[PDB]
Design a protein around this ligand. Structure first.
Ligand SMILES: Nc1nc2c(ncn2[C@@H]2O[C@H](COP(=O)(O)OP(=O)(O)NP(=O)(O)O)[C@@H](O)[C@H]2O)c(=O)[nH]1
Lengths: 133, 709
């Protein structure tokens, strides 16, 4: 019953996941190979993965949609977020990318409609100090 | 009793007993020797009457601090028992004993569980693929639970650990055991070892144990149809099961458990029987790879007295009257008295890897840096170690261990062979000591013999590293820990008459200019002969790290005579070497000096005067700005359990350590990579063994120099 964020095409990093997954009773090699296959099928973005454990050390991994942070960063063209949001604006985003990410988050979120997910992404960009147009 | 003499390597066994410190190993060896007939009555470590704990240090610390060898022959099979200390500070002696052994024995007590040091000892035994057998001892203790320890052993080291002998006792003093393979209950209630069928009080449990042991062994048996046959109801023959178990143990695939009462003598006879039957022979044992002198790999020799001569000293001891007592482990060929044999001093090339600052290969002793030495010596009278007594040996066949005295230059780990066929057995793994100990001799007479004494010390103990500082001029002893450092100091202070006083280790430092500055150097002295007058106006400006010394000439009009400019340069270099910070200035590197002006006298100008003027100008320029102090940093890789990660990380946080990454060593330990300044590592080992119930293991290596924060 944990959740982490890990690079798509990379497996077995020592700081983030190794000891984190070691003390939760989860086999690491099978998870790494299955996750690598899935995220090479995806091949696009780093992903958050949620691990659910059972009493027989069985592990189930749930792969969500790419994060709103990473999706907005890759859609805006910048690499790192603004160190002073709402004071320094480093990128501009149009409504088309916003609606694409809104559809993705509708596949992810509990929002009843696409417009709600678009507003959520706009708030996420506000936390990024990135203008939404 | 009789001297145990062996004429064939098959009839010889060389097993090293290992375990925790004070695991009663010495008492077990005494009980086995009494069962062998060499000793009339069993000795006691507390009384100090034991053969193994005969050295002064062992009795002083009331624990095994140095390893010893005992020889016993049983059922026509000779056994070379190698008792080793059970403390982490003496891990190198245990590893040396492991290398000179074809099997590993773990002496543990049922009243205490397997500690982490014992687990690491099992790992070390495992990483030579050594066969391992579990011996449960101290069954007379009230809290001795054979079942609990057995289980723990079965769970920890995989399903390959299954018990071989089932004790039957009252829970206080085990009166005997039940042979699982033989269905025989051994009794010692009347003081006599009696083998009788079990009365049936454990017959169901006995049958369960036979079933489990048979299923475990028979898998390791090459006959895959044996598993079917046993699962089909067929009773596998006892002799066949025995032989399959013997083969599997010789394959280092099974770890049987045999309970032993060292105090009562219960189980010693069967234990000797198991050693003589189930244990691998040196012919059965995978003999270590033998190398040619020039590093070319050579095919390992078969363990036979008729083969090419191949032996290896594994211990060096110093005795005031007898002289050096070198224990020689022989693998191939035959050693005969008065013969001239070749002494291969480890051929350091095979041991020149790593070594940290000391770069320890073999026998250190910086005047003897690396061993790599070859010499042919004529041996004297062959002897076998029996405490301080030496039983003379007529001849030494292959596969046995012997003690040779009066050896002038023979050293521990040296490969002995025929002079016409020099050989080099693969050296043992030498743990790197990481506890530097700077000392100061009390007199120069002691100092002159200090090199000889330290060389002989490293000859006796290959695990001790000695490094003499070239910058701070400090002699520094690298030790494993508190006990090992104390032993190293005492042996140096006694066996060689070298009175030394421990001093503070000096971490080497470097100096460089922190900014541009100029200095005016004047050297005028009016003595009874020629006057001296030389003035140099140099300009010193900072350089990037590692830029070295650069000289730029800007003398206009030849005010400084051009024959004396090299003297100014030499004086500047000498002043950089001698330091620029006070009376204890560290060498100055990565600076540029630009002599642009100066003054000279027609009669009072000399090269020495210009040297002094340049040195004084450099000193003034250094005093005209700040000086950067550069301290070294050593990368440290630590293996610690995952449950203690945070404590060690915070301790390094208080030690200014920069964490590089936390790598999963295994399912329960995490490798921590970090670079720590050498100052913080002076007492890192002792605090870590604290921060880790001793579980703390780390290695260090010099990384680079950095300025002080
Ligand atoms: N109950 C019990 N105590 C024992 C036995 N053997 C030794 N001891 C006790 O344990 C202490 C020393 O044991 P031990 O560590 O095996 O001695 P050592 O062999 O010199 N050290 P090491 O085990 O590391 O080689 C002493 O207090 C001694 O009385 C035994 O069979 N039973």
């Amino acid at each position: 019953l944990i959740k982490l964020q890990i690079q798509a095409g990379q497996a077995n990093p020592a700081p983030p996941v190794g000891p984190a997954l070691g003390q939760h009773g989860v086999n690491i090699m099978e998870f790494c190979k299955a996750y690598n296959a899935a995220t090479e099928s995806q091949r696009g973005n780093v992903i958050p993965v949620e691990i659910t454990v059972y009493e027989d050390r069985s592990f189930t991994f749930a792969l969500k949609t790419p994060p709103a942070a990473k999706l907005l960063l890759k859609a805006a063209g910048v690499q790192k977020g603004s160190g002073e949001p709402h004071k320094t604006k480093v990128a501009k985003v149009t409504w088309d990318q916003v609606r694409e990410i809104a559809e993705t988050k509708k596949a992810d979120l509990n929002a009843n409609d696409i417009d709600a997910a678009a507003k959520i992404i706009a708030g996420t960009a506000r936390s990024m100090g990135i203008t939404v147009e | 009793g009789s001297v145990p003499t062996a004429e064939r390597p098959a009839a010889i066994r060389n097993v090293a007993l290992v375990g925790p410190s004070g695991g009663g190993k010495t008492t077990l060896v005494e009980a086995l020797l009494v069962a062998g007939g060499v000793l009339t009555r069993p000795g006691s470590v507390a009384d100090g009457s034991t053969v193994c704990d005969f050295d002064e240090a062992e009795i002083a610390q009331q624990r095994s601090v140095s390893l010893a060898l005992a020889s016993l022959s049983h059922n026509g099979i000779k056994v070379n028992l190698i008792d080793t200390p059970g403390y982490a500070d003496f891990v190198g002696e245990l590893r040396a004993g492991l290398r000179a052994a074809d099997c590993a024995l773990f002496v543990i007590a049922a009243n205490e569980t397997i500690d982490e040091p014992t687990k690491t000892l099992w790992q070390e035994c495992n990483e030579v693929q050594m066969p391992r057998a579990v011996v449960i001892t101290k069954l007379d203790h009230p809290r001795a639970n054979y079942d609990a320890a057995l289980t723990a052993a079965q769970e920890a080291f995989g399903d390959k650990v299954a018990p071989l002998y089932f004790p039957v006792g009252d829970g206080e003093s085990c009166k005997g055991v039940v042979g699982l393979l033989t269905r025989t209950y051994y009794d010692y209630s009347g003081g006599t070892h009696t083998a009788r069928p079990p009365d049936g009080s454990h017959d169901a449990a006995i049958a369960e144990l036979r079933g489990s042991l048979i299923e475990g062994v028979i898998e390791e048996s090459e006959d895959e149809t044996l598993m079917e046959r046993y699962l089909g109801g067929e009773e596998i023959d006892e002799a066949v099961l025995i032989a399959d178990l013997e083969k599997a143990v010789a394959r280092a695939s099974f770890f049987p458990v045999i309970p032993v009462c060292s105090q009562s003598g219960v189980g010693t006879l069967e234990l000797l029987d198991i050693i003589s039957r189930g244990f691998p022979a040196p012919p059965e044992h995978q003999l270590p790879e033998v190398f040619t002198p020039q590093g070319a790999p050579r095919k390992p020799l078969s363990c036979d007295p008729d083969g090419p001569l191949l032996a290896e000293v594994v211990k060096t001891t110093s005795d005031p009257y007898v002289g050096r007592v070198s224990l020689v482990r022989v693998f191939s060929g035959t050693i005969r008295p008065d013969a001239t044999v070749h002494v291969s001093g480890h051929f350091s090339a095979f041991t020149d890897t790593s070594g940290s600052h000391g770069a320890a290969a073999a026998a250190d002793g910086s005047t003897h840096s690396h061993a790599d030495h070859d010499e042919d010596e004529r041996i004297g009278t062959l002897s076998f170690p029996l405490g301080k007594q030496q039983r003379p040996a007529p001849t030494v066949v292959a596969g046995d261990i012997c003690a040779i005295g009066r050896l002038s230059r023979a050293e521990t780990g040296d490969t002995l062979s025929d002079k016409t066929d020099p050989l080099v057995l693969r050296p043992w793994t030498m743990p790197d000591p990481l506890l530097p100990i700077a000392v100061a001799p009390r007199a120069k007479t002691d100092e002159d013999k200090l090199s000889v004494g330290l060389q002989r010390l490293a000859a006796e103990d290959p695990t001790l590293r000695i490094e003499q500082n070239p910058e701070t001029h400090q002699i520094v002893l690298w030790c494993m820990g508190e006990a090992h450092a104390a032993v190293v100091l005492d042996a140096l202070s006694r066996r060689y008459g070298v009175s030394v006083d421990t001093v503070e280790l000096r971490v080497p430092l470097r100096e460089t200019f922190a900014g541009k500055a100029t200095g005016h150097g004047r050297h005028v002295k009016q003595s009874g002969g020629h006057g001296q007058y030389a003035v140099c106006d140099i300009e010193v400006e900072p350089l990037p790290e590692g830029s070295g010394f650069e000289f730029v000439d800007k003398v206009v009009g030849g005010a400084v005579p051009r024959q004396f400019i090299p003297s100014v340069e030499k004086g500047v270099r000498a002043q950089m070497e001698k330091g620029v910070t006070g009376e204890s200035g560290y060498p100055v590197v990565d600076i540029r000096v630009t002599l642009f002006d100066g003054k000279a006298h027609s009669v009072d100008s000399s090269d020495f005067a210009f040297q002094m003027a340049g040195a004084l100008a450099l000193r003034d320029a250094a005093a005209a700005t700040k000086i950067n102090l550069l301290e070294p940093v050593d990368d440290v890789t630590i293996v610690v359990p995952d449950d203690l990660v945070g404590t060690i990380m915070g301790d390094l946080s208080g030690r200014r350590g920069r964490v590089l990454g936390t790598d999963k060593h295994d399912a329960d330990r995490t490798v921590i990579k970090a670079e720590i300044p050498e100052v913080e590592l002076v007492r890192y080992a002792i605090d870590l063994r604290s921060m880790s119930h001793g579980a703390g293991q780390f290695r260090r290596s010099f990384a680079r120099y950095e300025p002080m924060p």
